[PDB]
Amino acid sequence: NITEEFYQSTCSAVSKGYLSALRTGWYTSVITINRLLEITREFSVNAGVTTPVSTYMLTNSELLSLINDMPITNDQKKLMSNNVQIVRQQSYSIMSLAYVVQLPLYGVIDTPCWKLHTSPLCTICLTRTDRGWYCDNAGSVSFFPQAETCKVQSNRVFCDTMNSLTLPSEVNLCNVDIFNPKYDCKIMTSKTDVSSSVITSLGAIVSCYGKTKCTASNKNRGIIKTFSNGCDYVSNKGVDTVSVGNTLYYVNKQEGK
Amino acid sequence: NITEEFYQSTCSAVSKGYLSALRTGWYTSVITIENRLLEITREFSVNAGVTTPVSTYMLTNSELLSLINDMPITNDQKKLMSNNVQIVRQQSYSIMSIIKEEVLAYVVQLPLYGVIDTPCWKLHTSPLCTICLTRTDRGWYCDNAGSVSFFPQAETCKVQSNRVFCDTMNSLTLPSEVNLCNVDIFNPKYDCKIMTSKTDVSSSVITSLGAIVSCYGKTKCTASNKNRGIIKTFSNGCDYVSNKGVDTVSVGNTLYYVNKQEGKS
Amino acid sequence: NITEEFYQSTCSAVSKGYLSALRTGWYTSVITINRLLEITREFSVNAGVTTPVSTYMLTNSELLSLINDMPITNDQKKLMSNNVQIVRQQSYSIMSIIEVLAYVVQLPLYGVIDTPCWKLHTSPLCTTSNICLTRTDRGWYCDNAGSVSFFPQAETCKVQSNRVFCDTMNSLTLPSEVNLCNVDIFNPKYDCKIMTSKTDVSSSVITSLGAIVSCYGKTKCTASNKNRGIIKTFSNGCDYVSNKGVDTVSVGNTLYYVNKQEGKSLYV
């Protein structure tokens, strides 16, 4: 269900097909008491505040029981129930044996999200500067600039709205045209050639300029492409590595023994 | 007394009343050991020789107060750290040393606060439309030797009650005139950082003691109470809600929760 | 081998002499299994994903064995072998499905090595109604296939001795002409990023081998030695101090510590 589109005119790639869950609240629960030994160790090691929330601190069934108590839709309950791993990673446990457990509440769910990657475009060079995750919100778009804040599992993304930036939909036009009149796209500029590569979700972007030699290879077939002056995109189905000068980039994870 | 002031003219809220402690140094101490040893060994194996926070196994409550007493600082400083060992541990590191022949040696690293008891405030912001503007520099501010230190990454400051503890390592220094941006974005004494839009935008932001709601264009925004129900239907404006009288806010189909929701005990 | 240059004209300092290793890939390995107890605890505490990769999860020798399997040069293998601590810190371990316990270990592959890196620190510079400027792009820079990779988040780079290990995931690519911003902020070959003020500002910044002190307006700033007390009183300007000769700096009532302060030892 996940796709990636490449836009040569702006030297940027967009990974689409994700579905959202945006944290807009917290649900708290007070808890009192072999298992006690593990809880005690955790709090001693982390000075009274832990994350993720471990199974010792809260068991798989106790968690589902709390999910059921939460004041939310059934589709929401169902979604959290299938992603306890992420839910735990976005939760906190705080000592006050008494301690308080703190779980996320998702204000909105099943909205489109996409991730944006960018590379230099030269003729002078321009690079778009607003990389990261975007999600549709209440008719606008929430943008999440810090990579830490969004967790992905298959086609589901879970983001924290605490430090998000709200933007109009017209930002999408920057993908096609950097000089568009409806929104002022953020860019960075240079007066000299620059070459590099960026690994994206389903491939890689290669910006190759000036005298630099750039090549792409396959583990079995060796060198399959030599690039010249341009901005190009390569699929992870047909390419395993990219080379920019003497720097080697790996498009796929390299499976070991 | 912690308070929150809302400023409609800039669509921003400021949480005030905090008192500061800014880390400007480190105090180190070498520790040797010939049950507790088992826990220390595990910690270092799991964290590849460097840990934070500093656990009670690595350094006991009384050993810690003893070190706080050794540190070259004021008594009010000593008193402050003594009442906040939890935070102090969270801002400290423990580093394993060489593989000795007959002992386990490691170094413990504790914060030294270069200044204390200065005012801090936290700034939240939401979009203001008339074309829209949003102020950009959210986060913690603290007074510092006649200027203001600004801490843009939320991770860097720890709060407990009315005390804040921040790390000066990656701070930005600014003049006091930055306060004037709260009331007037177009003031002549300082260039307030803003982000702009040519189209309507709607959103909400949860603050410390409430929430801000920016509602523009065709979007429906409402605020509700548990008891009662819908109190307020908003139209085109920037409004603030107190967490004493409102529990939830709705922007289009997105629901925001102003209070933490208390669950089964 | 490691030096630091101060540039008064820009109120900035550059630490040089480091050598690079830039992560551009991952090497994965599937693993099946007293030791089992520790592994189980780690996954229960961290909800199935851990970093760093512990000795329980992967032993010192198993690690070197994997380093030997990796498709890379010998100098690379030699470098990682001397820095297992860092390698573990940059690696992940992820549990799978289901005494029959499977998990995947994830190690960095360094696309390039032994290139120069430097770190950039900056402080406010004020002049003339006063105007004041601060350069905004602090952090690590490394040479990379004829250009320069910049790493703005401090988290991403780990240092040990004169070696730096950085993650290219969130890097920004820049031309070499950025170096000219060290000497001249208003240079014509590159547009240096700056932040501005219309009022005086004073502060200090601790660098790798010293500290920078920006002292302006009515503020009093001093520098001291433990063995000699006050050795300098500053006036309106931007100055640098070496950590060999100075231990503390004072800006108004705020005290900064240039060196780590050695304390009392304990025994158990």
- Output the DSSP codes for B118-142: EEEEEEEE--EE--EEEE---EEEE
Residue spans of the domains in chain C: they are: 1-268
3-state secondary structure of A147: helix
- Is the distance from CB of B159 to CB of B15 less than 8 angstroms? no
Q: Which amino acid is present at B57? A: Y
Q: Residue B160 is encoded by which pair of tokens?
A: 């407990």
- Is the distance from CB of A188 to CB of C174 less than 8 angstroms? no
Note whether A44 contacts B54, CB cutoff 8 Å: no
Q: How far is C37 from chain B (nearest CA, A)?
A: 12
Cis amide prior to A52 (ω within 30 degrees): yes
- Is the distance from CB of C15 to CB of C117 less than 8 angstroms? no
Can you tell me the distance from the alpha carbon of A226 to that of A214, in angstroms, rounded to the nearest whole number?
6
Cα dist from A137 to A24, A132, C39, C167, whole Å = 12, 16, 41, 32
Q: How far is A230 from chain B (nearest CA, A)?
A: 32
Q: Which residue of B has its CA nearest to A67?
A: B263
Q: Which amino acid is present at A209? A: Y
* Spatial CA neighbour of A165 closest among A183, A141, A139: A141
For helices C60-69 and C74-81, angle between their N-to-C axes, nearest 10 degrees? 160
Cα dist from B9 to B17, B213, B219, C36, C159, whole Å = 22, 14, 21, 61, 47
Q: Which of A54, A119, A248 sits opposite C112 (nearest CB)?
A: A248
Q: Which of B24, B49, B177 sits opposite C256 (nearest CB)?
A: B24
How many other β-carbons are positioned within 10 Å of the β-carbon of residue B105?
14
How many other β-carbons are positioned within 10 Å of the β-carbon of residue C24?
23
C31 HSE (CA, 13 A, CB side): 21
- Is the distance from CB of B148 to CB of B176 less than 8 angstroms? yes
C-alpha Rg value of chain A to the nearest Å: 23
What one-character DSSP code corresponds to residue B155?
Answer: G
- Please state how this structure was obtained: X-ray
Sign of CA dihedral C59, C60, C65, C69: positive
Sign of CA dihedral A17, A19, A24, A30: negative
* Spatial CA neighbour of B121 closest among B8, B17, B264: B17
Which strand (E) or helix (H) includes residue B70? helix B61-70
> Could you identify the residue written with the tokens 């967490």?
B243
- Is the distance from CB of A70 to CB of A105 less than 8 angstroms? yes
Q: Which of C42, C218, C219 sits opposite B46 (nearest CB)?
A: C42
- Cβ-Cβ pairs closer than 8 A, A with C, add up to 106
Cis amide prior to C52 (ω within 30 degrees): yes
Positions of chain breaks in chain B, given as the residue before each break (C to N > 2.5 Å): 34, 130
Can you tell me the distance from the alpha carbon of C80 to that of C182, in angstroms, rounded to the nearest whole number?
33
Q: Which amino acid is present at B206? A: I
List alpha helices for B108-238, DSSP H.
none
What one-character DSSP code corresponds to residue A160?
Answer: E
Q: Which of C47, C168, C191 sits opposite A52 (nearest CB)?
A: C47
What one-character DSSP code corresponds to residue C159?
Answer: E
- Is the distance from CB of C261 to CB of B72 less than 8 angstroms? yes
- CA-CA-CA-CA torsion for B241, B247, B249, B250, nearest 10 degrees? -160
Q: Which of C71, C176, C189 sits opposite A254 (nearest CB)?
A: C71
Note whether B146 contacts C252, CB cutoff 8 Å: yes
Q: Strand pairing of A230-235 and C261-262?
A: unpaired
- Is the distance from CB of B2 to CB of B16 less than 8 angstroms? yes
Strands in A141-229 per DSSP E: 141-144, 150-153, 156-160, 165-167, 187-190, 196-199, 203-208, 214-218, 222-227
* Spatial CA neighbour of C24 closest among C109, C133, C113: C109
* Spatial CB neighbours of A61, under 8 Å, sequence gap ≥ 6: none
* Spatial CB neighbours of A220, under 8 Å, sequence gap ≥ 6: none
- Is the distance from CB of C157 to CB of C164 less than 8 angstroms? yes
Q: Which residue of A has its CA nearest to B221?
A: A138
Q: Which of C38, C198, C257 sits opposite B190 (nearest CB)?
A: C198
* Spatial CB neighbours of B232, under 8 Å, sequence gap ≥ 6: B222, B223, B239, B241
- Is the distance from CB of A15 to CB of A200 less than 8 angstroms? yes
Q: Give CA angle at C65 (C63, C70), nearest 5°.
A: 95
Q: Strand pairing of A156-160 and A150-153?
A: antiparallel
Which strand (E) or helix (H) includes residue A81? helix A74-81
Query: Considering only CB atoms, which residues of chain A are within 8 Å of chain C?
Result: 38, 42, 52-56, 85, 88-89, 119-120, 127, 131, 147, 188-196, 199, 207, 210, 212, 244-250, 253-257
- Is the distance from CB of C137 to CB of C193 less than 8 angstroms? yes
Q: How far is C223 from chain A (nearest CA, A)?
A: 36
Can you tell me the distance from the alpha carbon of B31 to that of B51, in angstroms, rounded to the nearest whole number?
15
Resolution of the structure, angstroms? 2.7
Q: Which amino acid is present at A8? A: Q
Can you tell me the distance from the alpha carbon of C38 to that of C57, in angstroms, rounded to the nearest whole number?
8
Cα dist from B34 to B57, B82, C268, whole Å = 15, 29, 7
Can you tell me the distance from the alpha carbon of B45 to that of B65, in angstroms, rounded to the nearest whole number?
27
- Is the distance from CB of C27 to CB of A256 less than 8 angstroms? yes
Chain B residues close to A30, C-beta within 8 Å: 265
- Cβ-Cβ pairs closer than 8 A, A with B, add up to 114
Note whether C48 contacts A191, CB cutoff 8 Å: no
Q: How far is A66 from chain B (nearest CA, A)?
A: 7
Burial profile B127-142: b = 16 or more Cβ within 10 angstroms, e = fewer: bbbeebbbbebbbbbb
Note whether C56 contacts B46, CB cutoff 8 Å: yes
